[PDB]
Amino acid sequence: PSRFTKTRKHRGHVSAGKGRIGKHRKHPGGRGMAGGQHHHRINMDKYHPGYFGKVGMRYFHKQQAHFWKPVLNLDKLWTLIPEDKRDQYLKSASKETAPVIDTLAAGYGKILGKGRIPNVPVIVKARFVSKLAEEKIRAAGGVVELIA
């Protein structure tokens, strides 16, 4: 709303908050990003280091689907199981009844071992896993079988 602005407050004051010397002008310092290696050099280096130059190797026709690999950490690993059945697998912490968790069906590409799943054996189906992620699943009695 315009009625809560400072424009309604500067009515009657000559310079409208811009100063009698400053004399608010069109573009006193340039338009856009003018003078980056120049009269705006200090602001660039202090706040945006790395802005100029090139750093790496190019990639022509990069499709962001060869790199789709959302990562799931072991700390959850159980939000995938519905909460209705989640309880009774914890009490039934036995093999031959181990739940099968397809991570790809949930939309994940890799499993990372952030830590501390419970001690219930569980079947985890995934495309990729980290080395530590599997060691915790195998220690808990479960196994990791790779899918594609």
Binding site: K46, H48, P49, G50, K54, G56, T79
Partner: protein
């Protein structure tokens, strides 16, 4: 004339009478503006002062943060007080039987505490239960874990999270950030 040593007509710099128009929150303030005055208990002044806080100054407290605080020696059966929001954590699988007083409970947090035999109560039910904050444990969520705090105090040789929109290669990863391209920060 007076040689004024300090600034004249300066406000305190602390918030009172919180700027929210929430009528139910003004009622909790009214109840604790009475308790703080007439009970001379430090608890009633901390809670009333915490009722004025803005959203960023009362960050959420997860149930895992409540459970960890009940693992302190002798705090197992203390009433947890959180002026703010109690959120839910799926990262913990066991939650103790405890009573928690908070402004709000998320649906997951309420289920976690209620399912474990505990109870979720409001701050006015705490007042009639512990008028002087008997056997209470005030908990506060993390403040500097916010995203905005990463960019406060940006400068050379600080590692202070440049305010950037797009990341990746060729986005501020160049002269000024490696010795190969000029200098490093």
């Amino acid at each position: 004339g007076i040689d004024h040593t300090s600034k004249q007509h300066k406000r305190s710099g602390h918030r009172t009478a919180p700027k929210s128009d929430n009528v139910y929150l003004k009622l909790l303030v009214k109840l604790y503006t009475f308790l703080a005055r007439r009970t001379d208990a430090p608890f009633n002044k901390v809670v009333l002062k915490a009722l004025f806080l803005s959203k960023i100054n009362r960050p959420p407290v997860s149930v895992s943060r409540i459970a960890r605080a009940l693992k302190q020696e002798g705090a197992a059966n203390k009433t947890v007080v959180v002026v703010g929001t109690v959120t839910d954590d799926a990262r913990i699988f066991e939650f103790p039987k405890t009573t928690v007083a908070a402004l709000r409970f998320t649906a997951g947090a309420r289920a976690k505490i209620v399912k474990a035999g505990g109870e979720c109560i409001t701050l006015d039910q705490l007042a009639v239960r512990a008028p002087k904050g008997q056997n209470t444990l005030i908990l506060r969520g993390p403040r500097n874990s916010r995203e905005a705090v990463r960019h406060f105090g940006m400068g050379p040789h600080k590692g202070k999270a440049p305010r950037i929109l797009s990341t990746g290669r060729k986005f501020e990863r160049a002269r000024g950030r490696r010795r190969s391209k000029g200098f490093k920060v």
